[PDB]
Structure to design on (36 residues):
């Protein structure tokens, strides 16, 4: 669960660029 | 978990429209 949450946060931080 | 990640990716791709 923590690994999936971290991956989710990384995907959000990546999608904050456009 | 794979289906959840696939749905997350689909929602991320859909979020690019607005």
């Amino acid at each position: 669960l923590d690994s999936f949450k971290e991956e989710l946060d990384k995907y959000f931080k990546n999608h904050t660029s456009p």
